[PDB]
């Protein structure tokens, strides 16, 4: 019966809690307590990219560490040459309520989506000189909150309906649908090998999915409120989440447990973008109080602040070669830091 | 200084910027509105009438263009979204106004409407956003009150002690009972609005029927007032 099934589920949940507690023998803070502090990290605004009419919700670096796509509520994507601040492309969108964007690893396509429930894909390199809509992927029943390219023919989308999907771009169809969340899925992060990916939703839980098999491997539950951002450690063995409870947390896949939380008493606004550095020694986190904090990812000591924005920081991206950090905010400016 | 291809790239960027200014002009000359309501509220009828008079299966947002006195308005309603609202409502914190349509002739779903209005009014991101509430379906309200079979006092006990305010303006000629009822519903909503506004945003009531052709004019007047107050703040006049 339903009561019997619920009792079995509760017993299994207690068993998983016990299994996690047994493997917890030394917190990460104890083992890191004898390594040198990072010291103060001063980052200076090197470039300021102007041109967006309205608030910026998402950005994504190119894999060449120089090109950069940005999405704003005015209804445009702009591809910037970060070194010279030139505008390479200006892509007008059909729906202005865009709130995610991705740059293909090959560099030929970009994707965007939002309240229209559609992950549109744009062909940057055509025989004609313009950018055209390659394909519109329809099938989500809620807003698209994140999109990440696996290659030029596969893309992973997380949506407002409690559901992620893996698409085939040539034939629009959803190849795999990942189900299991209870609230809106807000973020998404592909592993370095692009065989696994983690999604954080508004049920205050993050799940690691298997792209080929299609099933949820683990479920991580530590947060007190909804999860807004997620990113993999460059190792591929850990990920960091940023929530509305004004905290960031670092989970491990192998131990299946939360390692360290990044919180401060002065901070009461929610974190809305989270990214690592190349070494993973730094955890950069955006915030609603207009500023980005740079956390020493191994010791949970705030090492720096990136304070130059006049509105909330909505996106954050560390380049593939580690030279720069870009920050887009609701004041309609991006800023490249170094 | 910089090579020939770099100069040509800079010139391409400058042309992109000129197109961006052209887009900025039309972006700041159009006013964005968000339409909210329940299934029973005739917001679909409102949008259909506004589309007809003036000027894709799982799609999540619908857009409507309409123009009053050479001023452009964009009106978005959400089509395919889930029940939860706390995440996609942040996209609408720079709209000119929010249009909240409520069915005023139900009495069994009215408290749910007040709860939804309270959630909209007290939202963290929707501060400094004014609400144009349309107390819709006034004709059903009139018929229902005149029939007398369905009573309000059992749904809202406080209605008995309520009396019509002196500032009432029942225009066409109607029984005092329908006027008392409709001003009671309006006063419920306005109590919610004036409880915790703090003077940053206002609430504009309107008694409407779905057939009414004066809704676009009402929206235009309220938006004119909202921009007037915002300019008063911007130009350091208050």
């Amino acid at each position, epitope marked *: 019966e339903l009561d019997q099934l619920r009792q079995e589920a509760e017993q299994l949940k207690n068993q998983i809690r016990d299994a996690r507690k047994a493997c917890a023998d030394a917190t990460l803070s104890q083992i890191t307590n004898n390594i040198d502090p990072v010291g103060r990290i001063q980052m200076r605004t090197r470039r300021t990219l102007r041109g967006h009419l309205a608030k910026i919700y998402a950005m994504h670096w190119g894999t060449d560490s*120089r*090109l950069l796509v940005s999405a704003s509520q005015d209804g445009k994507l702009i591809i910037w*040459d970060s070194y*010279t601040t*030139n505008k*390479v*492309h200006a892509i007008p969108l059909r729906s202005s309520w865009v709130m995610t964007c991705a740059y293909a690893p090959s*560099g030929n396509y970009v994707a965007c989506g939002g309240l229209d429930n559609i992950c549109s894909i744009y062909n940057l*390199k055509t*025989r*004609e*000189g*313009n950018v055209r809509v390659s394909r519109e992927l329809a099938g989500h029943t809620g807003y698209l909150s994140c999109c990440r390219f696996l290659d030029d023919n596969q893309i992973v989308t997380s949506s407002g309906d409690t559901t992620c999907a893996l698409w085939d771009i040539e034939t629009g169809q959803q190849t795999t649908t990942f189900t299991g969340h209870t609230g809106d899925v807000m973020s998404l992060s592909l592993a370095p090998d692009t065989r696994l990916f983690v999604s954080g939703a508004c049920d205050a839980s993050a799940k690691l999915w298997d792209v080929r098999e299609g099933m949820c491997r683990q479920t991580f539950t530590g947060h007190e409120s909804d999860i807004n951002a997620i990113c993999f450690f460059p190792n591929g063995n850990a990920f960091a989440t940023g929530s509305d409870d004004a905290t960031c947390r670092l989970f491990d896949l192998r131990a299946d447990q939360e390692l360290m939380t990044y919180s401060h008493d002065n901070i009461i606004c929610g974190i809305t973008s989270v990214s690592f550095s190349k070494s993973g020694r730094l955890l950069l986190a955006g915030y609603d109080d207009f500023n980005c904090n740079v956390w020493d990812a191994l010791k949970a000591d705030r090492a720096g602040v990136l304070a130059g924005h006049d509105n909330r920081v909505s996106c954050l991206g560390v380049t593939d070669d580690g030279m720069a950090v870009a920050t887009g905010s609701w004041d309609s400016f991006l800023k490249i830091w170094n | 200084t*910089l*090579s*020939a*291809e*770099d*100069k*040509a*790239a800079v*010139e*391409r960027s400058k*042309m992109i910027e000129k197109q961006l200014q052209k887009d900025k002009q039309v972006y700041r000359a159009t006013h964005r509105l968000l339409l909210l309501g329940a299934d029973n509220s005739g917001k679909s009828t409102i949008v259909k009438q506004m589309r007809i008079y003036h000027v894709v299966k799982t799609s999540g947002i619908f857009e409507t263009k309409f123009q009053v006195d050479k001023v452009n308005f964009h009106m978005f309603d959400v089509g395919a979204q889930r029940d939860e609202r706390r995440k996609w409502i942040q996209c609408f914190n720079d709209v000119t106004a929010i249009i909240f349509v409520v069915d005023s002739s139900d009495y069994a779903r009215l408290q749910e409407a007040l709860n939804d209005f309270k959630s909209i009014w007290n939202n963290r991101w929707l501060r400094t956003i004014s609400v144009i509430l349309f107390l819709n379906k006034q004709d059903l309200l009139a018929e229902k009150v005149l029939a007398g079979k369905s009573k309000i006092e059992d749904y809202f006990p406080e209605f008995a002690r309520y009396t019509t305010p002196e500032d009432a303006t029942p225009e066409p000629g109607e029984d005092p009972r329908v006027t008392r009822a409709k001003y009671f519903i309006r006063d419920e909503f306005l109590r919610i609005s004036t409880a915790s506004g703090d003077g940053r945003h206002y609430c504009y009531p309107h008694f409407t029927c779905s057939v009414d052709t004066e809704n676009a004019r009402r929206i235009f007047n309220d938006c004119r007032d909202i921009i007037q107050r915002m300019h008063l703040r911007q130009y350091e006049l208050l």
Partner: single-chain antibody
């Protein structure tokens, strides 16, 4: 994509003649355009340049006040009004398409060309081997050299390689000494050092026979070089 231009013919000396270039199949208004000519049996020679948005116009010193370049974006055509045609203007004029942003490939499409006959401190590029014998199946190493270093402080060396089969117009093979253009097989590769450059065809096939021209884009005017003939 295609570019069809017209307006060439026998012109008495001292006359005038307008050449139009009708474009179709691509976003013309966002492409800079060039006019490139070659004398009846000589190499290519750059003539003029008009930018996207018509904001930059350049001419060769040999045609500076004589010719004028213009474009008509809504009608999607390109013009070259010419005045006082001397006898050194007998050539076949090519309409070339070029877009400039980070990573773009300029000079990627060339029109079929119009023949014109008239009755009776710039970088030099030299291609010394002015003929090469070759047989199907083996590897050739066409060479080129420069007067001024083509390497810029950016990191690019603006050297381009063009192939002209005995019939049709030139088609881009390599841009900025290392990048194969779209549609060119991986049999072609390029290298160089700043002043001396080479183009390697790994496994030559019967469609690679023609004349190979190089070109610099470091600064205007654009100079070419006589070109090596593969036979």
């Amino acid at each position: 994509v295609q570019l069809v231009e017209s307006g060439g013919g026998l012109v008495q000396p001292g006359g005038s003649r307008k050449l139009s270039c009708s474009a179709s199949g691509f976003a013309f208004s966002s492409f800079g355009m060039h006019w490139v000519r070659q004398a009846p049996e000589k190499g290519l020679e750059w003539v003029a340049y008009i930018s996207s948005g018509s904001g930059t116009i350049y001419y060769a010193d040999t045609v500076k006040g004589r010719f004028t370049i213009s474009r008509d974006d809504p009608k999607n055509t390109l013009f070259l009004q010419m005045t006082s045609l001397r006898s050194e203007d007998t050539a076949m004029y090519y309409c070339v398409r070029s877009i400039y942003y980070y990573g773009s490939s300029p000079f990627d499409f060339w029109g079929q060309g119009t023949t014109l006959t008239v009755s009776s401190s710039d970088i030099v590029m030299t291609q010394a081997t002015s003929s090469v014998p070759v047989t199907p199946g083996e590897s050739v190493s066409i060479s080129c050299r420069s007067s001024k270093s083509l390497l810029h402080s950016n990191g690019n060396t603006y050297l381009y390689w063009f192939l002209q089969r005995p019939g049709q117009s030139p088609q881009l093979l390599i841009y900025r000494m290392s990048n194969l253009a779209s549609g060119v097989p991986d049999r072609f590769s390029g290298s160089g050092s700043g002043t001396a450059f080479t183009l390697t065809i790994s496994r030559l096939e019967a469609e690679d026979v023609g004349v190979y021209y190089c070109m610099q884009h470091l600064e205007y005017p654009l100079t070419f070089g006589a070109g090596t003939k593969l036979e």
